[PDB]
Structure formats: C-alpha cells, structure tokens
Amino acid sequence: LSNAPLAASPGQADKVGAQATCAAKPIFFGYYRTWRDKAIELNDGDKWKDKLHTKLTDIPEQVDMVSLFHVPDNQKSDQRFWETFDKEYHPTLKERGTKVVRTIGAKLLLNKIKEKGLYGQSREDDSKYREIAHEVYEEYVAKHNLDGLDVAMALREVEKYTNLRWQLRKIMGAFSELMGPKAPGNAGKKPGDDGYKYLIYDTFDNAQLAQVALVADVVDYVLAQTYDKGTEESITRVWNGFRDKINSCQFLAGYAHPEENDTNRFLTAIGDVDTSGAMNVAAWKPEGGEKGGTFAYALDRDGRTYDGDDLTTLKPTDFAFTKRAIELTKGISL
Amino acid sequence: LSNAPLAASPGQADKVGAQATCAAKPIFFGYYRTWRDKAIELNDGDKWKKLHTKLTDIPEQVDMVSLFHVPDNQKSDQRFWETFDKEYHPTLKERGTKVVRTIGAKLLLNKIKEKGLYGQSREDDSKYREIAHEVYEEYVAKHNLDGLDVAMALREVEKYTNLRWQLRKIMGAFSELMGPKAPGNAGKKPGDDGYKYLIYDTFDNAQLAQVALVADVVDYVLAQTYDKGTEESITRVWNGFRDKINSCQFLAGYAHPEENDTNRFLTAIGDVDTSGAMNVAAWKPEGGEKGGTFAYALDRDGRTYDGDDLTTLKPTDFAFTKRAIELTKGISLTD
C-alpha cells in the first residue's frame, strides 16, 4: 500500500571487498529438487513415477540452509509433498536448526512486473512492485513459515536493457522491505538469529552479467554459479570480479551435481571427493578474508556422474560431497 | 551464425519404453536407390545403361521414402531431379508419401574434419551449424524435401569420445532445423504437412548405434535388423534400445538382395508369408506400438541371390512391400 519511491541502486553494499571478519559464520547452502522427493506425486506417464529414494530429511543434519527448488510443471500434484513438509520435514529441520528458503526464478518476477503494466523506469507507481513482492512473499515464504526467498537471476537480457535493470532493482527493493538487512522486521537481527528473514540472490559467476550492483545493498548472500571452475585461482578470479560490488561475507561460490538427462555437463563434483574441484571451491577463501560459505545444487545427485546408468537412473546418495563440503566450509569434522 | 554451445546428450528421449499410444500411426519406410531409377543417367560403359522401375511405381500406401543418392553411380542426375520436381514429387505429394534424403555419417565427419573441429565440449560450435545449414540447403531444401536421414554404420564412433562429441554436436545443429526440437516444427507433429523430419538409421545394436547421443532430437530410429527375421530376435534388439528411445521412434527392417552385393541378407527371400521380413513387419513391442517397418532397396523387392538375380535387374511386383504395409498398418491392399 506504501507509495514511497523505490530508489535506484547505489552500485555497492555498505562494505565491499575482502572482509577479515564476518558477522555470521560460513554456512553450507543446499538446493533441493522437490520433484525428486519421495512425497511428491509425479505424472502418470513419468518414467520416474517410482524410483524416488530420497526424502528432504535424508540430508545431513549439519546443513545450515536448504532451498526448496519447486517446479509445478515437473509433477502432477504437490499436495502430499507440502503436507509431509508441514507434518514431517519442517519440524525435523527446525529441530536440526536447518533454515529453509524458497527459490523463485527472475523470469516469473519479470512476468508479474509485465502483467502490472510496469515498464522499467525511475518514476512509476512503485506500490505495484510492493503488491507483487507481498503476494510472492505470502505464496512462497509465509504460507509454509519459511525463512526467506532466493531470487535466481540467470537472464542475460537484464544486463542489456536498462528497463529490465530498473524492474529488477525495484522488485528487489520491494523484497528488501520484507527480507534482508534493510527489512524493518530484521531490526537488531543478524543472519543466523532465530526468526531472521533472508534475501538471497543466485546468479552468474560474472558480476557484470549478474548485475549484482543492483542488489548488493539489499541481499544477505550472493551465490555465484561457479559450476565450471573447481580451481582456487578461478574462484579467486570470480571473487575479484565481484569484490567492488559486494563484500566477501556475502559471497558464496558453489558447484552442481550431475543431473539425469541434463545436457549441461558440470564436472567439478565428480570422482574422488577429497581431490575434486568442488572441494577446492568449498575450501577456497578470499585471500585475507572470510567468505559467506559454499552452496551445492541438486543434493539428491550427490556423487552422481554423467557416465553409465547415472544419466538415465536415479540412485540413493551417501551425501559424501555434502559432508566434506560442510567440513571444509565451516572448519569442523564430521 | 549462432555461436551458442551445442549441448551434450541427455542420454534418452523425453519418453522411453513401450508406448501404448503414438502421435503418428505406424508407417512403412522405403529406401530408394536413385541410380536404379529410369530417369537417372548411368555411365556410358554401364552394363545397365535395363532400368525398369521409376520412383512413382512404388505402392501409394508407402508413407515415407528415402532417396539414397550416390553421385559415383551415375553420369548425371539432372534428368532425374527434373523428373522428380516435375513428375515424381507432385504425384508423391498427391499420395501423401513423405520424401526424405539419406546422408552418410562418414561424409558428415569428413566435413567436421575439414572445419578443423575436434570432439570436445569447447570449440566454435558455429562451424557445426555452418555444416548443418549447408547440408540442409543442399540435401533437403534444394528439392523441397521433408527431411534428412543420417545413416550411422561406423564402428569407430562408439570407440572414440571425440567422434561421439562430433556426432552429438552435428545432430544438435541438425535438430535446430529438423526434428521435434526444431523451432520450425513448433506446434507441428509428424504427419502434418510441412513437418521436417530428422531420422537416424544405424546398427541394430544400441551400444554400437550410440542412439543415446541422438535419442532426444530424432523422430525415428531405424535399426538395421537385416539378419534377424524372428519376432524374438527383434524383441531382443528392441530391449537393447528400449531404455534410450520410446517404441514410437523404433523401426526394425529388412534388406532386399542387391546385385553384386557380397553381403547376403536372407530375411526377404522366398515365400512372402513365411519370410523373416514379414515376421519383422508383424512384430510389435510388448505392451506398445512401434514406429513402423522399413525396407532397403525397394527396386529389389522379391529378388534373391540365386540364378540371374545376382547379375540382372528386373521389374518388381512390390509383394514384400505390400505385405509389409498390410502387417505394419493393419490394412488390406486387395481393396
């Protein structure tokens, strides 16, 4: 209902560059594909209507934060899944102290912006951005008492068009009124405190394509999709790309587990765990500073490859990469 | 022109296994040797300078015919293509018979090598698109054909990772122009007018075929089951293929004996109703429907390797073709 203007981006967070100390300890972030959870009901003709081995609570208890990656087109119904989450998954995760956030694609946000009749400009009825933000917050976060929202922005057209940049900036500010460090509900709160509402941004590992300067001041964490790096020097190069827009405490580098029928080919998390590039990313730290943590995509595919039956079959997981990444990120032993 | 990366293979089609229903009804696929068409101009010294059959002689119930064109087998093809554009193709369009063109994978690999391309995830994938557009313009668009059929019978592809990458990338570049992934076929299905097919014919061994590299981009996979002729053997071949493709893509086939062939394919010899070729035509995957049945060298329908058949060309009554159409589509040709 507020009509206050959603201002332009300052271009950087309050503090930038490598930070020797951080307010919150490094976390392990995990993307969970809900259409691979045992409680979901896939379509009748789906080749994987069965063969669903993993539950959400199977993940290691030392996972600090898990993001539900929910795609409605990938299943027939999610009613059983959300009932199981409310009854079974979420109380267990709260008992473990594992935060649960929800991932939303920037394309859906831009579609909602377009339905509102909004272009991308400095002067517009910014209450409409707040309408979209509040509706998305109610549907995605508040409905199941989740801990925050993760906006996935992997669209190359945002960097090309000024109006799309304005749209992204304004919708992220409207979200910042509800989540993140700028939110009044988080007054006197810190990431890791109980009841904190996170605002998270996952995007390209190229800071220019990411347009992270548009969100740097309103987000708790920036997750750079370093799925092809796996080398300490390459992660350093990515961070040096980001270092003038955000501070190291916001930065998370990550890896992706091979997915069935994926065509993408991400190779850092294959083979021996202790010598993999994924664990180089997990162990990496900005020189002279501390990082926000490490993230992994598709926890259910921990240990899978693109060879043999892995490309066409689902299998249980031992979460070996996940456990070792937690150890290397937090400096603890499991 | 596009430099976007040609991605890797998902390893299987969107749907796999036996399918109770298919978008298109089972079809009969026919390979046509163009150097045996009456309109072709053979070499001056050629002993058969004796060409009995023309393309339009094939039964009208043939759903799809593939032109197997070899420049080294004739002097000139100008008269043949003029006859096709003027006479053959309008008649086939009236019958509703699709016409595709077969290209050998070895030629594609040679063009890949001329481009300086290796086989890896990196490289300049715009060159694969250059080759794909060149092949599409020369082979498909030039005579307003309905698609391309890539014949991959090379044992070295499965052996070498770089060759596997080359095959996957060239097939993806083709998929940008033909097949279910092509934007030109948006809102279209096989059987609609103007649909552009992407077809793959290969070994009847799924591992040697490397069908997992093309399963997601092709409309049909033709397994060369030329020595099977038994329902159980075709079932074993299909069980080899069933986790990579769905039954609607699968076609098993037979080969008619060719003159001076040395190959010896025996399934389509002798009495029609007791031949192995009609066992292949009648075969269906357990719990599902198949893409259809195909035959190589339609002009040799009914020929053997005995007597004068090995050294002479003859007209054909298309007996095997008609009975295979009947068994594949469940119709009768006596009316």
Q: Is B15 in Cβ contact with A265 (below 8 Å)? A: no
Where does residue A258 rank: exposed (0-12), middle (13-18), buried (19+ CB within 10 A)?
buried
Pick among B6, B9, B169 to test the A interface (most A CBs inside 10 A)? B9
Q: Is A312 in Cβ contact with B12 (below 8 Å)? A: yes
Contact, A137 vs A178, CB < 8 A?
yes
Residue position matching structure tokens 């190291």: A248
Helix (DSSP H) and strand (DSSP E) numbers for chain B: 10, 8
Amino acid of residue A71:
V
List of chain B residues whose C-beta atoms are within 8 Å of the C-beta of residue A265: 7-8, 121
Q: Is A261 in Cβ contact with B11 (below 8 Å)? A: yes
Interface of A to B at Cβ within 8 Å reads 45, 47, 260-265, 306, 311-312
Which two three-digit tokens encode residue B275?
């031949």
Distance from CA of A102 to the nearest CA of B (A): 27
Residue of chain A with shortest Cα separation from B169: A263
List of chain A residues whose C-beta atoms are within 8 Å of the C-beta of residue B15: 45, 47
Q: Is A311 in Cβ contact with B11 (below 8 Å)? A: yes
List of chain B residues whose C-beta atoms are within 8 Å of the C-beta of residue A312: 11-12, 243-244
Which two three-digit tokens encode residue B49?
């300078």
Residue of chain A with shortest Cα separation from B8: A263
Domains of chain B: 27-329 (3.20.20.80)
Q: Alpha helix (H) ranges present in chain A?
A: 79-84, 90-96, 106-115, 127-140, 157-160, 162-176, 207-210, 232-242, 277-283, 320-330
Distance from CA of A241 to the nearest CA of B (A): 23
Contact, A127 vs A2, CB < 8 A?
yes
**Cα A251 from Cα A255, distance rounded (Å):** 14
Task: For residue B187, give Cα distances in angstroms to A89, A152, A263, B193, B196.
Answer: 41, 29, 24, 12, 12
Pick among B22, B123, B168, B243 to test the A interface (most A CBs inside 10 A)? B243
Paired residues of B251 in beta bridges: B222, B292
Distance from CA of A94 to the nearest CA of B (A): 37
Nearest CB to A312; choose among B7, B15, B243: B243
Q: Alpha helix (H) ranges present in chain B?
A: 78-83, 89-95, 105-114, 126-135, 156-159, 161-175, 206-209, 231-241, 276-282, 319-329
Cβ partners under 8 Å of residue B313, min gap 6: B36, B48, B50, B51, B52, B259, B299
List of chain B residues whose C-beta atoms are within 8 Å of the C-beta of residue A263: 7-10
Q: How many CB pairs under 8 A join A and B?
A: 28
* Closest residue by Cα to residue B51 from B59, B60, B41: B41
Contact, B230 vs B187, CB < 8 A?
no
Q: Is B15 in Cβ contact with A47 (below 8 Å)? A: yes
Nearest CB to A265; choose among B17, B121, B244: B121
Q: Is B17 in Cβ contact with A306 (below 8 Å)? A: no
How many Cβ atoms are within 10 Å of B21's Cβ, its own excluded? 7
**Cα A152 from Cα A156, distance rounded (Å):** 12
Pick among A74, A261, A307 to test the B interface (most B CBs inside 10 A)? A261
